[PDB]
């Protein structure tokens, strides 16, 4: 059963590199949400400050 | 943040499961052949690994999982209805009168 | 029996087919999904009353 | 015929030296030479090439259809389905005006000649290339719905009017209300002929609350079968909103007074009062094109009594339950329960052994994947929803009053 | 089934682009009796009413899948059956034909399963399309009751987590701007 | 039987038997199916405000 033992510890290595990589995926498209409502923020203050510029 | 921690956690966990499986090849390969009680809880404690949930348990989990998710849908709804009132507010000065 | 449970002595009815008095045990632990429907549906008919009348 | 060689050669210098701008604002122009010379479009067809000439060839078509003396319609509609297959149409949506006439002429000739089956598969090409976006909503859908209606062919419709289209188009203000009336009207009609009485409801509901300063025949039988529907899905008249209309809502009550009565005793909850009632005014309804609404208004009230005896029994024999909602014996009972049942609008079982139907509440204790793949869509939609609210509020953040105010 | 909706979708299809404006014989009759199949009681109906008569008259077999069709309406299964194989269907409806008769089976199947706590043998014959002997031993194998004595049947009535990460993380990303 | 068509009795009657069964509905179920009906509604007022929006927007009404 060492084998066994084995091949069980692997299991549960590669699960919980598997929810390592989930989880980092998370913290990439958390990243990439958060750029993007900056971008959209950016934007909104660009347009306003085109329109003070053109009164 | 949350997510993060989750992460240290299952990092440290995993790093215990590391030393777990390196301590058993090197038993495997050399060192005390069987170190008694350690390699057998270990062994038991690999067994116990699948756990096996009962159709109580399942039941809960998707209860909570449920009502959870409808405080969820709760919160999207009165954020959505707020955008909607704003929305609503700002076109009523866009062309509306009164 | 029947005095005490129009009494609110007794949490429970009775069943006079089988001879039998069965008590609410009352172990669900909720009344609080009753406040959370309540507030859900009073909140959202006065959401959707001051659309109607903002629109 | 020397103007028109003009017209063609001024169309090919603005198409081939890249003048987008100018070819618009040429066909956008008086164009008098175009309105009355004739005999010589053809040769302008053929002697124009594609894509932006296509455009040019679109007015050409256009003036045709303008005319009573349209040309065989075996060949027009070949070229016409030439153009729309080789359409290069990056700058129609300036013309939308033009293009919406075109279509309007062409439905016309359609109702005319009886034949709606092929319109459906045109005015659909027509309803993509000019359209920007998904929700966008445009006068051709109004006469896509009638071609589905009248050809009786409404699988086209469907996925069109599945998607909710929060953008009307002015057509270079050529866009009447009557357009917007028709196709909320038609697509309605189209709903109710699937058995979607929630979507045909709410599309009835949106032709009433249309502000209109005159009352118009479409819309008054538009609410006309907003009451149907409404009687059917939810047994009731649903009120109208607050944010309302304008004296459409006015005029349309005393005007369709019948309706209401019908209403009022389908209140009631008596079959046998009801069927006497449309007895009575046979000939009242019967100018809708449908009958069978009424029936359906009576086949609903049996499956409202039926529901409400669900609330109210566990367990009910046949011969009780025909004798409550008046039918004619157990047979018909036990048909309508399994009837309902197949349609997924009753949870309840019938023992024939002692003639018992046995009902049941929602088997749904809500700890199923399905009721959260469920809410998860709905989530999906609400956040889709929350997007498209934030982008149009977005929009009007960028208007000139709002910035005015605020500086 | 999922053949019968891709070929549905192209009979659809191809009488939306009829050249013209009328469909083969073929193509009609494959509509009619693929909307049978789905139970589409409504298209199958306006359809009938949108084929002109002169089809209908050269064409008697579209009459008798639109009786078939009546009788589906009536629900009257009897009925359904004997004028599903009273009729013969050509090489492009007999398949067709033979997948409503299993729909019909499958349908009736379960209308008595889920309604029917208890069912005379031959109302439950009568309902299958088949006589009442076999139709015993083919619900005593599919673990149902009957008594001999009265001839009534007791019929018995019967996420992965990527998209859950992924569903969270858009409840996250909506309420977090 | 009238008086639960009109309410407050909360009973079932089982005509079978003749035994009148009282009704105690779960609370979390009811909840959840009017929670869903109120996000239906509430997602039909919204797609009638958004309608109605593009129709004042881009001034659409009977002349």
């Known amino acids: ?55 | 943040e949350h997510l993060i921690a989750q992460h240290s956690a299952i990092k440290m966990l995993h790093s215990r499961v590391k030393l777990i499986l390196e301590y058993v090849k090197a038993s495997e390969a050399g060192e005390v052949p069987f170190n008694h009680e350690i390699l057998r809880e270990a062994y038991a404690l690999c067994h116990c690994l699948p756990v096996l949930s009962t159709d109580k348990f399942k039941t809960d989990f998707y209860d909570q999982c449920n009502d959870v998710g409808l405080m969820a849908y709760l919160g999207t709804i009165t954020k959505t209805c707020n955008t909607m009132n704003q929305f609503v507010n700002k076109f009523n000065v866009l062309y509306d009168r009164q | 029996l029947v005095q005490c449970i129009l009494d609110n002595t007794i949490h429970g009815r009775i069943d006079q087919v089988n001879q039998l008095l069965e008590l609410d045990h009352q172990k669900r632990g909720g009344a609080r999904y009753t406040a959370l429907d309540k507030w859900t549906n009073q909140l959202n008919s006065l959401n959707q009353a001051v659309v109607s009348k903002l629109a | 015929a020397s103007a028109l060689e003009q017209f063609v050669n001024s169309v090919r210098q603005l198409s081939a030296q890249g003048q987008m701008t100018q070819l618009c604002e040429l066909i956008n122009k008086s164009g008098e030479l175009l309105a009355k010379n004739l005999s010589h479009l053809d040769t302008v067809l053929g002697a124009l090439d594609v894509q932006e000439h296509s455009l040019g060839v679109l007015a050409v078509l256009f003036v045709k259809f303008s005319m009573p003396s349209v040309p065989d319609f075996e060949t027009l509609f070949s070229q016409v389905q030439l153009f729309i297959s080789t359409c290069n149409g990056e700058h129609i949506r300036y013309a939308t005006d033009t293009f919406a006439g075109l279509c309007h002429q062409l439905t016309n000739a359609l109702v005319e000649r009886k034949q709606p089956l092929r319109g459906i598969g045109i005015l659909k090409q027509a309803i993509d290339k000019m359209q920007m976006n998904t929700n966008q909503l445009t006068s051709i859908h109004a006469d896509l719905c009638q071609l589905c209606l009248l050809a009786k062919c409404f699988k086209p419709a469907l996925p069109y009017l599945d998607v909710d289209m929060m953008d009307i188009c002015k057509e270079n203000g050529a866009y009447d209300a009557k357009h917007f009336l028709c196709y909320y009207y038609y697509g309605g009609m189209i709903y109710t002929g699937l058995k979607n009485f929630e979507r045909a409801l709410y599309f009835y509901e949106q032709a009433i609350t249309t502000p209109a300063m005159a009352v118009s025949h479409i819309m008054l039988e538009s609410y006309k079968k907003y009451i149907l529907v409404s009687l059917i899905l939810l047994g009731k008249v649903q009120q109208l909103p607050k944010y309302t209309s304008q004296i459409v809502g006015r005029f349309i009550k005393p005007l369709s007074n019948a309706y209401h009565e019908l209403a009022q005793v389908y209140s009631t909850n008596n079959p046998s009062e009801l069927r006497n009632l449309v007895n009575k005014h046979s000939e009242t309804f019967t100018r809708d094109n449908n009958m069978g609404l009424v029936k359906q208004c009576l086949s609903s009230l049996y499956k409202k009594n039926i529901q409400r005896l669900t609330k109210t029994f566990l367990t009910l024999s046949l011969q009780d339950m025909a004798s409550r909602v008046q039918l004619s014996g157990p047979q018909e009972a036990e048909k309508y329960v399994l009837h309902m049942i197949e349609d997924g609008e009753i949870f309840a079982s019938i023992n024939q052994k002692d003639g018992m139907v046995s009902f049941h509440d929602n088997p749904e204790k809500y700890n199923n994947p399905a009721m959260l793949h469920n809410i998860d869509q709905e989530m999906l939609k609400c956040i889709e929803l929350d997007e498209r609210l934030k982008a149009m509020d977005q929009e009007i953040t960028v208007n000139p009053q709002f910035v005015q105010k605020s500086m | 089934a999922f053949s019968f909706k891709k070929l549905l979708d192209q009979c659809e299809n191809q009488e939306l682009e009829a050249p013209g404006g009328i469909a083969t014989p073929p193509v009609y009759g494959q509509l009619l009796a693929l909307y049978l199949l789905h139970n589409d009681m409504n298209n199958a109906r306006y359809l009938w009413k949108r084929i002109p008569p002169a089809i209908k008259s050269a064409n008697s077999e579209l009459g008798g899948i639109w009786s078939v069709g009546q009788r589906i309406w009536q629900r009257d299964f009897p009925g359904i059956y004997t004028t599903i194989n009273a009729h013969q269907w050509s090489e492009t409806v007999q398949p067709i034909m033979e997948a409503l008769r299993d729909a019909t089976r499958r349908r009736a199947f379960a209308l008595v399963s889920q309604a029917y706590t208890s069912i005379i043998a031959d109302d439950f014959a009568a309902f299958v399309g088949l006589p009442v002997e076999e139709a015993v031993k083919g619900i005593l194998e599919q673990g149902w009751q009957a008594d001999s004595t009265t001839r009534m049947v007791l019929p018995r009535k019967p996420i992965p987590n990527e998209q859950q990460l992924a569903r969270l993380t858009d409840y996250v990303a909506f309420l977090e701007n | 039987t009238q008086l639960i068509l009109e309410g407050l009795i909360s009973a079932r009657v089982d005509s079978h038997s003749k035994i009148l069964y009282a009704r105690d509905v779960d609370q979390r179920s009811t909840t959840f199916e009017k929670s869903l009906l109120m996000g239906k509604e509430f997602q039909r007022r919204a797609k009638a405000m958004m309608l109605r929006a593009a129709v004042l927007r881009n001034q659409i009404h009977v002349k």
């Open chain 1, 1 to 55: 059963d060492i084998n066994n033992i084995v091949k069980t510890l692997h299991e549960w290595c590669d699960g919980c590199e598997a929810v390592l990589l989930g989880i980092e995926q998370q913290v990439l498209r958390a990243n990439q949400y958060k750029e993007n409502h900056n971008r959209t923020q950016q934007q909104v203050e660009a347009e306003v400050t085109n329109i003070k510029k053109t009164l």
